[PDB]
Design a protein around this ligand. Structure first.
Ligand SMILES: O=C(O)C1=C[C@@H](OP(=O)(O)O)[C@@H](O)[C@H](O)C1
Ligand SMILES: O=C(O)CNCP(=O)(O)O
Length: 427
């Protein structure tokens, strides 16, 4: 199969203008599609996950145009819930936010639509969301394994009292929050217990407000939504740079800088992953905050032991950065790594051991003890963009590393390797 071999990188230094945020991009596209008016999105991400959402919108009859580099999109709002019949199949690759958000949104009114995706997507849980949508009146059928896509949506979500489990994915709540305002009746969403990946809920509420809708958040335990609302185009909207994609570059500087500045995100960003910079600071790196940039300058790198539930994606970057840190690093409260693009706890532990680390794969945590020196390995990437990007950091040592299926980074960052190369210096 395909592979890419990265030669040792002596130093990293420079500036990266970040690709658009995948999380903001897919929420903005869906809200723009449901809204009244024309929305112009700029700095939109061009990647597999966004392409599947754009394809779904096209299939649902939404009109839009894209610039040559696919980062500017003019969307003609539908002025209300999207609709299609005939069990129209929407293929969503392995795009979780698209699958979860559309599963809820397409429950508005009547419809007959099937959502499916790649084999791994049929193994990613969605039962907590289906349970919630059904309490609200939706008719949903599992076409294969119970609690997983593919789903056949036949509409009927009207609102009411809806409980939702937030212990496995915040995306279920996010999906409900964006959908509920357009339901005819008022909705009270009650979180059953724990809520993971909480910062993503703030991204959702931020986007909803931009598109003209606010709800009552009662300490993230219950959300009160007024039905019969409408989303409104915000005119021109600037998609923030992706803070998760930025992690690789900031970590690279913490390990082998130099100073690396990423632009497109700053101290005012709505993304929880900018908090990744805080972790690098705690490990010993120096961080600079700007209005439209965050930079990291090499200092030292010490092992840390922390709960990473607030930055599950960027946390993977700390797992490979740990190979360069003094001491044993422990990342805790990250059980849902197991239900994402791949089981990330198993995958990360397996590949880290290949370059020499001693690793304890905990049920919901990972403990990493770096080797005195890294060795060469051919890294398996599990159709997971982040395994490829995280392990690219192994090359910031004296050993090269071979990354299998490097194009898997296209899920959220097609140009990843060229960008890492841009800040890679020989001197
Ligand atoms: O809402 C979002 O944009 C996302 C929420 C997270 O998922 P979980 O809530 O399942 O942790 C994250 O891992 C994913 O990449 C994007
Ligand atoms: O981007 C990541 O690291 C994980 N994504 C999970 P999603 O497919 O967006 O639900």
């Amino acid at each position: 199969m395909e592979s890419l071999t990265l030669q040792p990188i002596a130093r990293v230094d420079g500036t990266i203008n970040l690709p658009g945020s995948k999380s903001v991009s897919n929420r903005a596209l869906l809200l723009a599609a449901l809204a009244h008016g024309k929305t112009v999105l700029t700095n939109l991400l061009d990647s597999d996950d966004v392409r599947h959402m754009l394809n779904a919108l096209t299939a649902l009859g939404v009109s839009y145009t894209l610039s040559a580099d696919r980062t500017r999109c003019e969307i003609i709002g539908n002025g209300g819930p999207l609709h299609a019949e005939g069990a129209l199949e929407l293929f969503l690759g392995n795009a979780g936010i698209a699958m979860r958000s559309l599963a809820a949104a397409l429950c508005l009114g009547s419809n007959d639509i099937v959502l499916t995706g790649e084999p791994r997507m049929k193994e990613r849980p969605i039962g907590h969301l289906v349970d919630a949508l059904r309490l609200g009146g939706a008719k949903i059928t599992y076409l294969e394994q119970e609690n997983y896509p593919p789903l056949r949506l036949q509409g009927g979500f009207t609102g009411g009292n809806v409980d939702v489990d937030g212990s496995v994915s915040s995306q279920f709540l996010t999906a409900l929050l964006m959908t509920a305002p357009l339901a005819p009746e008022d909705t009270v969403i009650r979180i059953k217990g724990d809520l993971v990946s909480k910062p993503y809920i703030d991204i959702t509420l931020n986007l909803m407000k931009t598109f003209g809708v606010e709800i009552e958040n009662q300490h993230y335990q219950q959300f009160v939504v007024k039905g019969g609302q409408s989303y409104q185009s915000p005119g021109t909207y600037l998609v923030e740079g992706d803070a998760s994609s930025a992690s690789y570059f900031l970590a690279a500087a913490a390990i082998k800088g130099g100073t690396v500045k990423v632009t497109g995100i700053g101290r005012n960003s709505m993304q929880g992953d900018i908090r990744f910079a805080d972790v690098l600071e705690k490990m010993g790196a120096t961080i600079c905050w700007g209005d439209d940039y965050i930079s990291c300058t090499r200092g030292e790198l010490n092992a840390i032991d922390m709960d990473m539930n607030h930055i599950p994606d960027a946390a993977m970057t700390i797992a490979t950065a740990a190979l360069f840190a003094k001491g044993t690093t422990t990342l805790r409260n990250i059980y849902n790594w197991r239900v994402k693009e791949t089981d990330r706890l198993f995958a990360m532990a397996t590949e880290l051991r290949k370059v020499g680390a001693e690793v304890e794969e905990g049920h919901d945590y990972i403990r990493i003890t770096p080797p005195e020196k890294l060795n060469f390995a051919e890294i398996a990437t599990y159709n997971d963009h982040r395994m490829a990007m995280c392990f690219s950091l192994v090359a910031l040592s004296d050993t090269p590393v071979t990354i299998l299926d490097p194009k898997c980074t296209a899920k959220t960052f097609p140009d990843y390797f060229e960008q890492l190369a841009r800040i890679s210096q020989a001197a």
